[PDB]
Q: What sequence folds into this?
């Protein structure tokens, strides 16, 4: 009967999944009694064998194939199969397992033998694992400057024994507390943890400068560890690493139990390329200790470096220019798409995170209303009033907009008709006669709203659709694709109008904005941004017409040159600029009034060497993105031609 | 020299693309002079030949392959290639073209011959095309009732000659205007269009009932055409058809120039299956008229029917119950996912659209603030306070919620702390002691907000992620996938709290809501909705725990049974119900105050025969989804067990 063979195969498959799912006791309970021709061990001993051995090699994911179950005698059935499993040294493949089953009335059991752990095992053999951790690779900028590297850090700590009794003990703590900027309550709390022992060195802080006077008990020790040279200026992008946990290993055995793992940003995105592969040997030995079989063996491979398009000098300038306010700044070389800077403010100290951080300091980052953990350059926002230049291009392309047509606009508020109720589009300057150029120079939202309505939704979307809404940019930074609105239709003249000047339901992150605005530096060609230096330049032709660009850019030079251009403060710099400012009124439930976002777009219209998009989120009164752009503009202009 | 062969191949490729892009004059201008051994015709005559022939067969998309260009003599090069093109009768494939090129100094030209139109053509041959339009298929409900079919419509019209002079002419118009509900200005305007001729029959309207008294000039004629039996009650779903235009044919030659095309809803989604394929013959004949070659020939294939899960009776009831207000109602048989009703109100008359509609009536639909064209069942909305039951399930699954724990809540407003500013979560009933059951019965948002905050974002998302946010449901209805929020993180306790009771940045359309709530009728298993009757049932196991369902459903029965349950009016019906009401406060720019959306969720907890989700958008004071649910609930309960 194959009626028994059915159960035979079934038993082995159950045994196999029991091991696969790490439930060794369940597997043990499917074995025959301990005997000469049956199971070599008892259940408890089998359980202990797998737990000990499979645990030592971090075995995980036992999968089989080519199963066969024939019969040899009434009471015994032989079986065989190929198998593979993952370990802390990679996958073991094409392993040949075999043994026999014991049929008994309505019970089929496995005559367990040590060879069902690893095929070549017999009797009291042993397993040995040896390993070498791989060194983590580095993240460097476009010129080789380090962004994430491995430094030799100075570490301060105290030895309770060499501290004192009561007299100096209290005074020595004072000395080190002031000498190294440390709350003396943190020091006492540090030295009184359950693990601390009178003689041990109790680590306290990392000295990131020249080592000063050392009081009694205070001492410095070198330790290797990750180091982020730009600090918080590039924390959201770069991210940080943390101690590997038992839980991380459970998900991926190929990590180093004793190592570091990327917890955020690029460190995580490229954790694999950066961590390399563990070196080592997994072997079976005999009772004595002689090597009997090498299951896996390979030399360590250190992590490889990742070279970015980022310009460390630009990153820092972009970040510092935000003055610790909520905002972000993206800078590119629009003809190739290189991301020179990806700044987000406020930020967090990645060196503290990776070197052990106070549980209250961490919470301080989380509860901070300005949310430093957010990567603002990868977060979607209404693009703001700057978007008028896109709407304008579309209008010129489709013929809806005559640059010379002059709209007559009275006052600072406008609505199509009474169906809009109390809603009205708003502008800041009351200019009566407004043509396109005048609308761009003064940032006139009423003009663009009117032209958007004139154009109509069908044509406006036809133009928007030629951009990148909906697309997943090919970047190692988590983000959502830009959207025009929540649905395929606005179903609203108000929304259509608001979308026309960058408000409405538009969500476009800064990287996506720089991507879209690149058309003005490539005659209507859109150039996708890139972050990895070696990557090839990718673009998308005919997003807007060359005529539209040649019409609009001269107007954008006036936004700077003209005495009433919104970006005229930048004309003083004396460098060729084409720019466009913008705002975005946002509503919040917590705030009585509404918040305002300030934006700046700018590039060199002579050589198309650089481009930058900057924004201050929920700006303070009198603050502005333009007000903070000079240094970066001077720097990019100087080095990117 | 292959230097000339380069140009030879190039010339043919240019000639080919010129034809491909329909620019026949450009192709003609690459031919040699008219001669015995050169081109058979002049350019103007070649131009006219393609325009006439390729135009007659709606040729489009000429593509070649296996190009070869050898030489025969110093002055002549022979060429050949396989080709294919689309036509009004489908694609022509494996066509063998051949001819010769004329080299001359630095100019290579094609010695054009009629065989470069169709391969077997010679001299003064002709092309003939004959066709038979396919009959459009039908859209029927789960029991065969027609939803989109082809009826024989009665059409009223007038004959100006048989109308009068001045006396009866003015009086006869009065008679027909009142006898058929027609503005007599429309009648005069109708009979005075530039095309109208004294003797012609001027069509005016479609009589959708019994034909009444016929005044002088008024007459009725039968015409075949699409007919929608449910009318506006299923207009958004079904959609309508319109006259095929030259522009439609330009995009797809396989359509019938003389036919109908789906412009919206299912009629469009399944336009192809429904339209069938044109029958006909494309042949080449000789000067005389004798058939010389049949290029393509096949019999017509009428469109095939599409059978939906919809229950026409339920569709109409669901639609009528909305009383012309803005809203939508979805109904299913949650164990299989069948969509019994997909109602959206207000609506538009699909029979008017397909039978020619006033340009002002069409505009009336568009400018209507309630936007009847929107398919509300496929539009994303904040799910509302009903969502508390999902949040509750997650809380029970992860152990954050103890059903018996009693929160003490004072008043109708609550905020975590002062960081929330003036923002506060709000509830309608001031119940001091609130446990889960009590929170569900009274629809207590403060309770769920507190539990959501307690649970925390990481766990809340872990639970939400087991649902269908992000997924593209497999349905022939255009929609966007549901979203939890705009980003992967809320970055806000307020948003986290609001999301907990169905507000915040949640966007879930009604079909997606019914999909999610199906877990309560399948022990935590989610069952994907289906619209096509023959389609196989698809599900997703373990979205929530069986314990959570067994805990929550009894509470949902109390929402109906308990005297203070929000859905207690429905207890009168005397049918087994488990329900949950909800609201959603929305803000608008046009309105001074905020708008409110009312929702109802309900199903039979005894047999899981049906489920329904209904919503009134921007409801009028005192209106409610629950207030309008009885008839549908009585009907579904009766027929879906």
A:
């Amino acid at each position: 009967e194959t009626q028994a063979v059915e159960a035979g195969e079934k038993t082995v498959e159950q045994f196999v999944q029991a091991l696969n799912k790490g439930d060794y006791n369940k597997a043990a309970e499917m074995t025959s009694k301990k005997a000469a021709n049956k199971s070599a061990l008892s259940e408890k001993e089998i359980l202990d064998k797998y737990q000990n051995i499979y645990g030592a090699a971090d075995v995980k994911g036992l999968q089989i194939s080519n199963l066969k179950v024939d019969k040899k005698d009434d009471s015994t059935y032989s079986f065989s199969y190929k198998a593979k499993m993952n370990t802390s040294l990679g996958e073991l493949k094409d392993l040949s397992y075999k043994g026999t089953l014991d049929r008994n009335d309505g019970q089929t059991t496995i005559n367990w033998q040590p060879n069902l752990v690893f095929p070549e095992m017999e009797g009291n053999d042993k397993v040995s694992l040896t390993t070498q951790e791989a060194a983590r690779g580095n993240i460097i900028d476009r010129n080789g400057e380090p962004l994430a590297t491995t430094g030799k850090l100075k570490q301060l700590g105290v030895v309770p024994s060499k501290l004192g009794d009561g007299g100096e003990k209290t005074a020595n703590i004072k000395a080190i507390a002031s000498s190294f900027d440390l709350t003396e309550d943190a020091i006492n709390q540090a030295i009184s943890q359950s693990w601390v022992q009178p003689d041990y060195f109790v680590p306290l802080k990392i000295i990131d400068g020249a080592t000063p006077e050392l009081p009694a008990g205070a001492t410095i020790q070198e330790v290797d560890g990750r180091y982020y040279p730009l600090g918080e200026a590039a924390a959201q992008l770069i991210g940080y690493v943390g101690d590997i946990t038992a839980e991380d290993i459970d998900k991926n055995p190929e990590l180093s139990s004793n190592g570091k793992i990327g917890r955020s940003g690029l460190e995580m995105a490229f954790d694999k390329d950066l961590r390399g592969t563990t070196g080592g040997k997994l072997s079976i030995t005999d009772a004595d200790g002689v090597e009997k079989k090498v299951l896996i063996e390979h030399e360590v491979q250190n992590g490889k470096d990742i070279k970015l398009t980022i310009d460390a000098k630009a990153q820092k300038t972009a970040f510092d220019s935000l003055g610790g306010k909520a905002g972000s700044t993206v800078a590119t070389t629009p003809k190739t798409g290189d991301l020179l800077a990806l700044a987000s403010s406020p930020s967090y100290d990645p060196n503290k995170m990776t070197n052990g951080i106070s549980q209250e300091d961490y919470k301080a980052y989380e509860e901070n209303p300005e949310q430093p953990f957010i990567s603002r350059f990868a977060t979607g926002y209404a693009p703001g009033s700057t978007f008028k230049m896109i709407t304008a291009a579309i209008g010129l392309d489709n013929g809806t907009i005559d640059p010379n047509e002059v709209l007559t606009i009275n006052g600072l508020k406008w609505q199509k008709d009474s169906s809009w109720g109390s809603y009205q589009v708003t502008r800041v300057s009351d200019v009566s006669q407004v043509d396109l150029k005048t609308a761009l120079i003064y940032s006139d939202n009423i003009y663009m709203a009117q032209e958007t309505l004139k154009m109509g939704e069908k044509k406006f979307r036809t133009g928007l659709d030629k951009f990148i809404f909906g697309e997943d940019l090919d970047l190692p930074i988590s983000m959502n694709p830009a959207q025009i609105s929540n649905e395929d239709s606005f179903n609203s003249d108000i929304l259509l109008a608001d979308t026309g000047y960058g408000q409405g339901e538009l969500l476009i992150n800064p990287i996506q904005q720089a991507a879209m605005y690149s058309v003005f530096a490539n005659n209507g060609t859109l150039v996708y941004p890139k972050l990895i230096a070696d990557k090839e330049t990718k673009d998308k032709k005919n997003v807007i017409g060359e005529t539209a660009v040649q019409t609009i850019v001269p107007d954008l030079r006036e936004v700077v040159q003209d005495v009433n251009g919104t970006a005229h403060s930048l004309s003083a710099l004396g460098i060729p600029l084409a720019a466009k400012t913008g705002t975005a009124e946002i509503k919040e439930k917590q705030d009585e009034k509404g918040k305002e976002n300030s934006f700046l777009f700018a590039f060199n219209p002579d050589n198309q060497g650089y481009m930058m998009v900057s924004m201050l989120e929920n700006k303070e009164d009198d603050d502005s993105a333009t007000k903070r752009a000079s240094e970066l503009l001077q720097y990019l202009n100087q080095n990117y031609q």
The CA atoms of residues 315 and 437 of chain A lie 33 Å apart. Residues 314-639 of chain A form a domain with the Beta-lactamase fold (CATH 3.40.710.10).
